[PDB]
């Protein structure tokens, strides 16, 4: 039996699926700890930028979980992603502890731009600005990639990097009441929010796990972008970003919520 996690329903992904929009033909790079083989995922390729770790398999779990929120397969098992037909690429930029470097993240963004990815999901952050990170975001954006990044989990009224940079779409987290989750960073630069509490998804060992974080909100938006790209294959990264914001359900102050809750039904109408 397949379950539909609450966040997938909350962003109205099944309504888009009923229109025939699943993310087919859209290339999504997951810049994370890797992605492990799993019966409910189909991984098309990828690359590792972590020294001495040549495989894209996930030694942590975080990247596999993020990947399943984007693209867990629509079948009779497991869960269901926002964009179950998206082409997933594992770009390993974080080590098994969840730590990375600016150099590994920047190289992953360069790879995404050079390999024609449509969306890059960055469920990660750094507390300090880095010109190398900013340049890599700008370079990927100029090449055509939509960069989607987590606002961070510190609870503070500023958002992490690279989400804070203008050319990254910054995603915060909501709970089941459509309130901002207490940990979700907010403030200047926040674009949109998505479910980020008690998110069930794929996990290494052919299993499933529930996690909390802005890391879990971000892939709902990356998946929604893939649905919009399938419907509108000529649209640019900037057009998709603005359309997601324009069709979001407002939740109140833009300082706390950005444009509001991502809505895949409204975005694909
Ligand atoms: Ca499934
Ligand atoms: Na931003």
Residue numbers in the entry: 1 to 269
Paste lines from the article.
The crystals for both room temperature (RT) and cryogenic datasets were picked from condition G2 of the PACT screen, 0.2 M NaBr, 0.1 M Bis Tris propane pH 7.5, 20% PEG3350. The ambient temperature (RT data) were collected at 297 K, and showed negligible radiation damage; the cryogenic data (cryo data) were collected at 100 K. Images were integrated using XDS and scaled with Aimless. Savinase was crystalized in space group P212121 and diffraction data were collected to 1.1 Å and 0.95 Å resolution for the RT and cryogenic crystals, respectively. qFit and Ringer were used to construct multi-conformer models of Savinase for both the RT and cryogenic crystals. The structures derived from the crystals at room and cryogenic temperatures are very similar, with an RMSD between the structures of 0.20 Å and 0.37 Å for the backbone and all heavy atoms, respectively. Thus, the two structures show no regions with major differences. From the multi-conformer refinement, we find alternative conformations for 28 residues in the RT structure and for 25 residues in the cryo structure. Most of the residues with alternative rotamers are serines, 14/28 and 12/25 in the RT and cryo structures, respectively. Except for the peptide segment 128-132 in the cryo structure and the dipeptide 103-104 in both structures, the residues with alternative conformations are isolated in the structure and do not appear to engage in any cooperative network of conformational change. We have demonstrated that Savinase, except for alternative rotameric states of 25 sidechains is well described by a single conformation for the RT structure. The qFit and Ringer analysis of the crystallographic data did not identify significant minor conformations in this rather rigid enzyme structure.
The 269 amino acid subtilisin from Bacillus lentus (Savinase) and the homologous subtilisins from B. alcalophilus, B. amyloliquefaciens and B. subtilis are the most studied proteins from this class. The subtilisins comprise a structural family with an α/ β fold and a monomeric nearly spherical structure. The catalytic Asp/Ser/His triad is located in a groove on the surface of the protein. In the structure of Savinase, two structural metal binding sites are found to be occupied by Na+ and Ca2+.
